[PDB]
Structures are given as C-alpha cells and as structure tokens.
C-alpha cells in the first residue's frame, strides 16, 4: 500500500518485530529451554538450538522482514566465527534498545556508548586464562556436550598428553561401535588441486608422494601469465635437472582454466619424467598473504612475487625435499618431517610468538592477534583423525556434531579466555564499572553527572540482570523472598543454580563457564545493532 | 496467515489435534471395535486395523498436520519391527500428556520420567517365557487370528514337532483348495544377484547348483576396486585350478555397475569353464558386519577384509564345497549340507549362544541381543514353504496375511515374552511399583515425598486403568456397581471379559495374552512422544 | 471442508443416503412400478429395471457417494450371477438397518444375526423343486416376460421335448419376421483361439474340421516354456506320424505372445501337412481346473500337468478322433460324436452326479455344487440356436433381451428351487422360525429370553411384511379394514393380488413364483451390508 | 472425594502463603493427622491450632455441615423452575 513509512509508524513496527523475535529465541536459552517445531516443506525440525531458530524465522509482510534481517545476520555471523553466542546477542539487542528509548537527546546516546564501551574493557580485563594440565577443561567439555562421560574424558586427555604442541582434531564417519584414534604428525596445510587432472588416476584422487620440490607464488595466475610458465618450467627441467626431486609443486593463490590447460601440455611435453601415471607438475590453490609464507617455510620453498622469477634461480634457492606429502581435493597433508626441517619451522614459529609477546592487552584479543595464533597451530601441532562410531548410522552423524562442538569450544577456551557463567560475568562487569569511576576522586565530578545522576547507571545495572532472570526465573533460587537481591554480599560470592543437576552454588564451584569471546562479541554486536534500530526513523519498500 | 505460532495458541492446537486422533484410533481397539471407511481415490477401504487408520489420517491445515506427524511416525515404526501395538501407543500418548499438564515445574517432569522408567523395569521382570511343547502357543495363535481352528492348530504343531531347531515359515500363493507343506532343510540366506546377467538364462533366473567355492568380502565394491578383481580372479583360475569347484561366488556388501561390467568380461575371458550357459563367476550383494561372518561359516568361505587379499591365498584357506545351493533374485537357499559342515555351523551357533548366556537381564531385551538371536535362526532352523490355498483368488491373498500375522506373533512370543492381556499387565506393574518403594523402609522417606504425597502415583494409577476401561466399558463387567473397583482383591486374581465368547474369568484362564515387546515399546515410545508434545511451546510453518 | 467425519455425523449421513436410495429403487418394484428418466449425456433412458436404477444413481458430495458405493456393488453383483433380485436386496438393507438401530449392545447384534441365519435355513428347506414335464414352467415364463403368449409356449415345449438332457439356448439377430430354430447336438465348449493367425484365412475365422488329435495342458504357457514346445511337437510329428489325425490341438489355460510366435514358426517348419491353408497346430485358451478335465473327456485327450510330458507319450495315450469340430473366436462347438465316445462322456457325467447324490442339504445350494452342475450341462445337453425375428431392427434387439431373461429364469428355476411370490415366502419363513423355537420345549427357555421377550421377534415379523406392503398398498386388497391382518388363518392360505390381471387368490393358484436363489441371496446380502452400515461410525475422505 | 472436600476450608485460608509455597500442593498424610500444622494469619508464625490459639465453636461448624447437606441436596435434585405469578 505505502512503500514510504515515516514517523511513529516505523519505530512502532521496529518494536513490534523485535518483541516477537525476542520471545521466540530467548525461550530456547539454557538446558531447561522449550522446543520449537520448524517446518521445511514436509519434514518437522524439532530443535532447541538458538542459531537455527534465528535463521529459520520468516514473516508475512515485507516491512516486518526488512527489520528482521537487521537482527538476524549479525547474530548469524557470531556462530560462523566463534560457534556460540546468538541468543545472548539477541537478548541484549532488546535490552539496549529499550535503554536508548528512555534517554533521548543525541548527547545521551553518546554517554550510553562510552559507558558500555568501558564495560567491554572491564570484561576483557576480567578474562581468565587456563592451561592444558588444569582440570577445568573437563568441566567445560561436560557443560558444552550436555553431560557425556566418554566424550569429555577423551578430548581432555588428548590435549593433556600433548603438552607443548596444540593438537588439531578432525572427524570422519566410522563403521565400528568403538571409537578409533590415529596419533600421527600429519601437518595440515591449506593447499589443494587446481584441476582434477593433476592427481593420481587423473580424476582428483588422493596422491601420496615421497619427495618433492615446492615453489610458492604470490600472484593470482590467469591467461596473461601463460607465457612465463612455459619459460620458467623448461628452464628448471633443462638447466637444473641434477638438483631436483619429482614432482614439482607450483603453489599459488588461484589458478584459472586458461593456465591449467597450458600446464597440462607441459606435462605431456616431457614424458620421460612421468613415473607410474603421476604428472610431474602440479598447480595448487589456496583461499592474508602470510599464510603462503608458512607454506614456504614448511616445504623449504623460496618465496616468489612474480611468475618471471622462476627463470632467475640457483642451487642456493632451489631445495628439493625428501620427506612425505599427501595431496588432496580438499587439503594437503605433510606427514614425514626430518629433524633438520623441524628446526627451521620451530624457529619461524618463535618469530610469530615474539610478535605476540610485544602486543598490548587490547591488541591481544583483536583479529590481528587471532590470525597470527592460527598460523602457529598450522606450523606446530599434531593431527589426530578420530573415526566416530555408534549403534546406528543416524547416531554416528549426530555424535560427529557433538564431537565438533567440544573441539571448537576447548580450542577457543585456551585461546582467548573463560568467564563465570549463569549471567554473572556481565553483572560483575557493570557493577564494577559504576563503582570504579565513582570511587576515583579525580573524575567523580563528571562521572556522576553523566551516568549515575542522570540514571543511566541505575538502568544499566538492571539490564545486566536480564540473563540471570531468564535462566533462573520460576526455580528454587528465585522462589525465596519474591525477587532477587543484588547486594554487595552477592557480588563477593555469586550464587547460581546448575540446571542439569539441581544443586545451588558458585559458577566456579559447580563448573558453569562461558568463553570470553562469545560474551564480548554479543555485547559489542548488541550495542551497534541496538543503536541502529533506535536511530532509524524511516523505511523504504519500493523496488527500483 | 501467521507462520509463527507461540504461547497458549500452540498448546491449544496440540491438545486439539491429539484429541481428534485419540478418538479415531482408540475406537478400533479390540474385536468389539467399530469400523472406519477410508477413501483412496475411488475405492472404499473399510478396516478395523489400527496402524492403517493412523497412517491414513489427513488434516486440512498445515499446523494440524505438523502435529499429527509427530504422533503418527513413532506409532507406525512399532508395527514395522514388532507387528503389533499402535493403538495402545497412541492411547498412552494422550494419557501421559494429560499427566504432564497437571504437574508443572521441570523438577516434576523429572520425577514423572523416573517413576515411569521404574514401571518399565517391573514390566521387563514380569515377562514370562514359554516353550514349544507348552499348549499356550495354540491360545495365542487362536487370539491373534480372530478364532480359526485349522490355522492355529497347524502352526502350533509345526513348532512342536521340530523340538530344538526353530522353524522358519515362508508363504506363497496356492492353486489347490487344501494347503500343501514342504518339510525341507533349505537353510535361508541373505544373499542375492548383483546383476541379472549372472543367473541361468542371463535374465535373473533361479540358478540351482551342485558344488561351489565361496569367498566373502567385507568392503563395498565400486570403480576403484576394478583392478584388484582382475588380479584376484586370474590368480585363482591359473594357479589354484586343481582344488576348485565351479562356480566361484564373490559374496560382498554392495556391487556397483562399474564392477559388474568388469566381472562380465572376466567370464567371457575364460570360456572353457562355462558349463551349459552358466557363468562361472557370480557377484552377490547383502543389505551389522557379523551377518557376513555367518555366510562365511555356512559355506566354509574365508573372511576377507580387502579385495587385494584374493591373490595371497592357499589350499588351507580355499575350500570348494560339494553340497547344493539355489541362487535367487530376492534370496539364496542352501539345501544339502554334509554332517562335517553341520558340525562347524552348530559350534559357531553355540558361540553366539554362550555370549547370550553371559548377558544381563536388561541387556537380554535390547537390540544387541535380538540381533544375535536373529543370527541363530539363520544358522540353525529348517525352512518350511506353505502354499496357502482357498476357494477364490481374493481369499488366498487374504489368508496369506492371516498366516503371516500368526507366524510373526508366535516367533516373537517365544523370543521375548508373554504377559496377561485385557490391560491387566500395565495395572499390575503400576500398583506394584508404588507398593514396592513405599514398603521398602530405606527409601520410603523420599519415595513418598516425590511421587505419592505430591499425587503423581495416584494419577498414574488412574492412567493404567485406561486400557481396561476402553475395552470393557458398556459390557457385563462394568455394568455392576457403577464404576470398577481396583482393590487388593482384584490385584491377586484379576478378572476380564473375553470379547469373542462372552464369558468372564482371568486372562490366564480364558487365554488372553499380549507379547512383551509390544506393551513395553508402547510405554517407552509413549513417554518420549508425550514429553515432546508437552514441552513444545512453538510452531513454525514458513517454508525456507 | 472436513475429511475426517466422526460421531453422530457419520450415522446421520448414512441414514440420509440410505433413505434416498430406498425411495428411488423400491418405487420401481413390480409391474405396477413408476418409471425413472435417466440422462446419459444427451439421450433419455426411461426404464423400470431396478438394477439399471441402482447402477446409474450419482450424488454431488463425496461423503454421500462413498456410502452409496457400499449399497450399490453388492446389489449389482446379484444380477451378474443370478439375473434377478436387486430391489428386494436394497429394500431389506433399509429394513435390517432399522432393526440394528433399535437394539443396541453388541450382544443384541449377535442375537439378531443368529435369528436371521435360522430364517435363511428355513427358506432353504422351504425350497420346492420342479420337473420339465410340469406345467408350472409356463407360469414362470409368462410372469418373467411380462405376459407373452408365443415366447412362454416355445421355450416351455423346448425343455419338455428334450426329456433327459437339459437343452442350452443361444440367441442371434434374425432377418425374417418368423422365428427359426436349429435342433442340433452342437456340444458347446469353453475353448477359443489364442491368436487370430491359427484360423482358416489367417484372420480369426470360423474353422470347421472333420478329424483332430487334442492334447490338454494344465499350466499357463509363456516365454519360459518355448523350448519344451519345440521338443514335444517335433517328437509327435517324427515318431508318432502313423497314428495321427490332423490338426493337432494344444488346449491350455493361457497362451502368451512369446509362445504363439514360436508355434507359428513350427507350422511353417513342416509345410507338407498344411492342407488348403489350414495350420496343422492350434493353441487354445480357456478363462477351477476340472473344466479342462471335461474338455479332455469330450475329445478323448490325455490330461497333462507339465509341458515336458508331450515327449513321453505312446499309442495307448495318443488318440486321434474322427468326429466333427468347429473352432471359433468366442467358443468352439463339437457337433458329430460317435456312440463309442458318448459312452465315455455319459459315464464321466454319472461320476459327477454320484458326488452330488452324496452331498448334504446345505451343501447342495453352495457354490461347490452349482459349479459341478455347470459341468454336467457342458457335457450332456443339446445346443439350440434361435435366430430371433421381428418387424423392425429395434424390436429384434429388444426381443433378444426378452428371450435371454426367459432362458436364464427357466434354467435357474429347475436348478435351485421355486417359492411362492408376492412377498409371502419371507413372511412364512419368519413366522415359522419364531413358532418352531417357541414350540420346542427343550430350548424354549433361552429362545424366548433372547428373541421373543426382548422384542426382536416382534420386530422381525413386522419387517417381513415390508415386501407385501409395498406391492399391494393402495390396491383392492389393502383397502378393506384399514391395515392387513397377519393371523394364523392367513398363514395357512395366503392371499395376494395379481397386478397384471387384477384378480385375488393364492400365489400358487394365480401363478406368481420367485426363484429360490434370488430371495436367499437378497437376505444373505442384506444382513451383511446392513450390519456394516450400522456398525460404521467413521468416514475418511482425504486422498493419500 | 469426601476427603478432598474437607481440604477446601484449609486450601482457601492458606493458599498463596508460606505454608502452601513449599512442595507445590499440601500433603495430607498420617503424620499431619497426628500433629496438624496451620498458619496464624494475624501474626505470621507457624504451628498447631492448639499451640497458636485458633479455635472455633462447636455449634457453628456442625450447623454449617448440617445446613450444607440439606441445601446441597435440594439444589442438586431440583430439575424444574416456575416464574409465573398466579
Ligand atoms: N548447566 C547449566 N546450568 C546453568 N546455566 C547454564 C548451564 N549451561 C549453560 N548455562 C548458561 O546458559 C548460557 C548458554 O547459552 P545458550 O543457551 O547455548 O545460548 P547461546 O550460546 O547464545 O546459543 P547458541 O550460540 O546457538 S549454542 C550460558 O551463557 C550460561 O550462562
Ligand atoms: N478376545 C479378546 N478379549 C478381550 N480382550 C482382547 C481380546 N483380544 C485382544 N484383546 C485386548 O486388546 C488388545 C489388542 O490390541 P489391538 O486392538 O490389536 O490394538 P493394537 O495391537 O495396538 O493394534 P495393531 O497393532 O494395529 S493389530 C490387547 O492389548 C488385549 O489386551
Ligand atoms: N404379476 C405379479 N403380480 C404380483 N406380484 C408380482 C408379479 N410379478 C412379480 N411380482 C412380485 O414382485 C417381485 C418382482 O421383483 P422385481 O420388481 O423384478 O424386483 P427385482 O427382481 O429385485 O428387480 P430386478 O432384479 O432388477 S428384475 C417378486 O418378488 C414378486 O413377489
Ligand atoms: K543452548
Ligand atoms: K485390533
Ligand atoms: K421389476
């Protein structure tokens, strides 16, 4: 009817939509959540998973849907990178929106943003670190998997045994009832075939090799670079044939169909070097330039900027390895590595760690630091392939998902940090931030005027409670004395209820923990999305 | 209109749907049931069978249908594995749902689950076993077939005569008025042709053989294993030709179209061994790895993991049998077996029985034990092919179904257990479980507090009555003294009414019996489905 | 709107539908019936025939139609086997339905069934037999044909002249005004051509033969038996050529297109035996295995189970007849039969009659006995072909139908039995059954308690009246003294009104008779259909 | 049924109080019959009707139940109402 919506009408719809989503999702929070039945054509999808709920919600009107997609996509993006924290995000989205509405005037919006930012900074400082030898890892594994004895014990011991190198765990569909483990080196890499022709059997098979001579290229290769490939390859085969171990690996960013067809002819050009059907030249692709530098260090390959640099080479630069490599369609795997090669890789790993030593406190939790930590795991770390078993085929597939969540949780736990659960960490952060600025006599004049005296602090303290209310409302804890009392006594020793067992105690005592990155991203993502929904006064539905 | 449904609305619809299904199905229970007319395009399907009713119910709204499919599929799955117990299942689904509604608070849901679980445990202990020499088998056969003199007598004698080996009964469409029996050994197997070409006549016919040399493979064979088949076959024909009885049988899990085409050429490669058109090499498929181990023991074949193991073989491993086998499109049949071969098969059968001897009480009724008992019947047991006759063609087809239900009932009867019918077994179980915990002085403090004092026990005792009410309401039994009195006098000697005859007495006296697995699965399936329907507060209808 | 119908709603619709059908059909009963106009696209079909009415009734709603098809098809099935009794059936369907409704409780339903069953038994005992020399046959022929002098006289004399052998009458479209008769032997058989190629002219013509050598096969012949046919045929032509009369007839159950193509080549293989274009080998099909045994006895052919038995034969088994046979597209006809062959056929006919002599009273009216009596008519009995004439072409076609009904009536009359018409036989049966049990002092205690004292007998006595009411309401008979008086005086000498003439008297005196099988089947079919309509409480309209 | 009906006075007085809050509903066992606990609504404390001092006159509760039975029977058995003024 009306494509242009402005005024009281837009903000009315925004609050309407937000309300309906908030009820649907927040109901699924915790082990004591209520289930949702989703239709997907003919079948029924009954689930309690928050991210599945948020993704699957549809509306009738276009206006309503437009608003929904602003809430959905930032929440969906949290589980793609971390793995946990969507419901929490959406909860707070309502929470902070409500706040922005009570305090109008664009000076107050500034005051709210600055206050919450400082709360984030306290959360990052509150972040607790944990080692592989500590029994806390078993507690987190038991909570994330919804109480399993065999699953939590196996992964915890696996990280405990490999004291030094962080083990990488990958999964597969098993046939046996019992689970089977393969403790191997298997240094995982991010390279794979450009074209199916280059593998053993000429149909994208898994080629195993016992010797190679790798060369890393930086540029994306297309039809323009077809001339330089013929120049570089024939130079290497003719001149430097003495110091060479077949096959020659041309690792790069991307290989186009024009370049791949040229390299297929170059394999056919020299048929003498073809041993048992294997092509002696293989181009390899990788989906952040320093990841290729890791690939160069692992395989003792020289780093090359241009394609024309392949001609100007020598015995000093060219080094053919005699290890063991396994090329694949999805990824490559390096198994056998000599003590001489490991000395080079460990020294390069220390160099990245020395950069992380010099970083600041706030920069340690950034994307720059997390990317550098990802490079360390690729270089140092043993690969463990677990074929997950079960009674039926459906149970095997279900158990793989339960295995995957435990691995993703434990890895991110020791990486970033751990905080006390049951919606306590948020309460401690807020009550701390208000108390910190008020206690400090230098800035107490302005700190009180902006936040405390205006009433924003009071409101923000009530909003931290929201997670704690929703989990434990209509339970043994909240039954006593009407509402809950958030006094100084509670701040020192915070009590919660373990919903799995039933007993009452501290989040530290009972063993209820959340990852640091999940709660931080939720609050960061919550602030930005809440501001946008609040400040938006106009909606356009007209298709151009 | 609204794809998202939440609140009082969802649970209202759930109860609405459940009510309509409960009325439709429970009306068909017992011999005194009322018929249902089903349309299926143009024809009318008049039936009293509960599973047919549940499958055929459709609704107009998508919301209503969504709920229906949660009730239907678990009930439909009971008749696929057992053969009886759907109405009973659906009955209790309403029953336990109603219970969950009266006692809110997720602590009470836990209390209900634990209580019912213990009732299941009493039902498993109450399970009575029966032998082939006992006249009770005639009573069960007479009840299941809805009173037939010739049918019940014939099957009961058939199990009674073969005292030791459990006879397998298979059916076929006959031409004569009288029924005809074929008492043969005919050791049934789970193997059949991979491709129609390999049979006699080259069009999937029934090939009879008098000598063979079998080889069992574990892996699923595809295009990748085509090389190893040519290596293994030509090794066997060239080297080990002296100790060989044609034809060679390659039994495996699955044969792809790529592998079958390769083996067709290998038959054509050696035309000297082809006798009267029969191909000398046949690949065989089977739809749980230990079933192939049974196939290996029957035919004296060596168990092989890999396809490459066919090369590395000797006279010690290779053993060509001189019995009699009948290959087929659906299944294979082994008839002639020497006393030397039967000694090997019986010794292997004892080994599986020795594993069942060491199992626990609860583990004996599990899927693990039932699968092992299925292997015993395949190894030891004579096959009896009965060509069922009648007056017309329609009566022959109808009588085959009546024959099939009797066989499925009698086999599962002596396998698992038998309980007293007329909805008595459930009442005895519940009243027993309440009395057991209350009498035991150690746990009486908490047992009373959770179940009895809260009023769940009282409610659960009224719910066991439901089967007994529905069968015998508006009869001679219920007419006296308004309602029925469930006192200690009734618990000792429970009276029922046989609906077929009319007389009054005990379920043991009159001969009304139910299989153990049916009533157990109904209550197990009832608890889980009832909890889900109760805890579900949300419905989604939006197609992604 | 609602696919699921349950409760008061189903039974309401059932009574509604039943009522509308009952009014439409029962109005057409008797010569004083009212006509119905049926549309069938563009033309008008004005008829008084009950079966045409029942078949042609359609409804608007699917629910209503669903109910209709339960009433229609059992009534339609009565005219397919007997030829008369549909209206009567449908009448009683309403009658017994009404009964079942007055007496609820599944014990009373049992009481009603047992009572009516005994009434059937009295009807079977009441059945009167008649001979060909008796003038009663003229009376029945006059009633069935709706008063015709020439038609009733001709058929009655035809059965009277052939005293011993029951004559078979077949019809054809004539050209002359006068009717023409062909008194010939023409022993009718149930065999015809498998393929049109095998006849004279090679296009399914009428082949006349004067000599043959028949062979009867039991099995259905297909592509599997193509090998044994070539073995059997060439054995007979080569070895046993001396004792053979052409052509060779291969009589069987069914001939597939694969087998027929093989036998066509075998005719071409031996062209020396082909006389004037006639193929010397003919396969013959027949649409109950003992009908082929009759075919074997007629033609002196050996009975053969398997196709391979054609090889193992001798001069003792093989016997080539020198009679006269006429093969055809619809049926074959055997005309000339020697005194030697008739001695064999008559002796076989006595053997079937000796089996009918030893049968019980209840077994004599069964399908088993009727099938055996059908075999006697095929063996012994002269065929009479009457070319029916008339003034116009439309009158010839109409007269053929009037001829056919007279033949079907007279044949079934002397076969089963005759009872007094005007709805008297049913009244005598019911009043007799009530009086029989009450008079017998041994069982009078329970007989009174179940039927008489409860009031079922009283009700059943009113229901027998229904046929008598509907025929003679608003006539000279019912005009006197308000209603009709069913006293002991009427039971001794029952009076009726002949609707054709107008005069008053006994059904025996006036000549109003019904066939036994029609009234029995109506009441048998009425009881079963009435019970189903009564006990059905549910309707399903949802297409799967 | 009659045992559930005696509870009615006890439910109406003490529903949504400290006594009924614990363990969902109230448990009328043999332990309670020996020493019956109530809540004094004036003060707030919990104890026996004898201990706290909550007493009813005999004639009041008797007349209530006597009067209750007769009036309840009449209301139940009455199937007809006439409103027409003569
Ligand atoms: N056993 C437990 N007892 C009490 N509280 C718990 C327990 N387990 C988890 N929690 C709390 O509930 C929260 C768990 O979050 P979820 O309900 O999984 O929502 P979410 O993590 O946003 O949803 P996702 O990302 O789709 S798995 C944590 O923040 C804990 O504080
Ligand atoms: N002759 C009988 N007299 C009294 N009770 C009977 C008789 N036969 C069976 N029963 C009872 O009725 C139940 C039979 O179940 P059914 O009516 O067949 O329902 P169901 O087994 O769930 O339906 P299915 O699985 O589709 S055959 C048993 O549990 C018996 O207790
Ligand atoms: N001339 C007659 N006078 C009196 N009653 C007759 C006469 N002819 C027949 N009847 C009676 O009416 C009945 C004849 O049945 P119809 O009206 O033909 O119904 P119907 O036989 O069920 O219908 P069909 O099978 O389609 S021919 C018999 O049962 C007789 O009792
Ligand atoms: K969750
Ligand atoms: K049933
Ligand atoms: K008629």
Residue numbers in the entry:
A (entry chain B), B (entry chain A), C (entry chain G): 3 to 289, 295 to 551
D (entry chain L): 466 to 551
The authors write:
To mimic the conformational changes upon ATP-binding in solution, we also determined the cryo-EM structure of ɸEL in the presence of the slowly hydrolyzing ATP analog, ATPγS. Double-ring structures were again observed and symmetry-free 3D class averaging indicated nearly uniform rings. Applying D7 symmetry resulted in a refined cryo-EM density map at 5.8 Å resolution. The subunits assumed conformation I and were slightly tilted outward compared to ɸEL•ADP. Interestingly, we find a rotation at the ring-ring interface of 2.9° with a vertical displacement of 2.9 Å. This re-orientation would break the contacts between Asn465 and Glu466 with Asn465* and Arg469*/Gly462*, respectively. Moreover, the symmetrical van-der-Waals contact at the Lys486 residues can no longer form. Thus, binding of ATPγS weakens the ring-ring interface and this effect may be more pronounced in the presence of ATP, consistent with the finding of mainly single-rings in solution.
Our structural and functional analysis of the chaperonin ɸEL from the bacteriophage EL of P. aeruginosa revealed that the protein is ATPase active and functions in aggregation prevention of denatured proteins. ɸEL forms tetradecameric double ring complexes, which dissociate into a population of single rings in the presence of ATP and at physiological salt concentration. As anticipated, the ɸEL subunits displayed the typical three-domain architecture of chaperonins, composed of an equatorial domain (residues 2–130 and 425–552), an intermediate domain (residues 131–188 and 388–424), and an apical domain (residues 189–387). The domain structures of ɸEL differ from those of GroEL by numerous insertions and deletions, which alter the putative substrate-binding cleft and the contacts at the ring-ring interface. Our functional data rather suggests that the chaperone mechanism of ɸEL is encapsulation independent, and represents an evolutionary precursor of the more complex encapsulation mechanisms used by the group I and II chaperonins.
